[PDB]
Amino acid sequence: RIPNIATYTGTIQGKGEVCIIGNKEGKTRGGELYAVLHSTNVNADMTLILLRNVGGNGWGEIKRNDIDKPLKYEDYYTSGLSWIWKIKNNSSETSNYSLDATVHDDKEDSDVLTKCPV
Question: Which cysteines bridge via disulfide bonds (predicted)?
Answer without folding.
Answer: 19-116
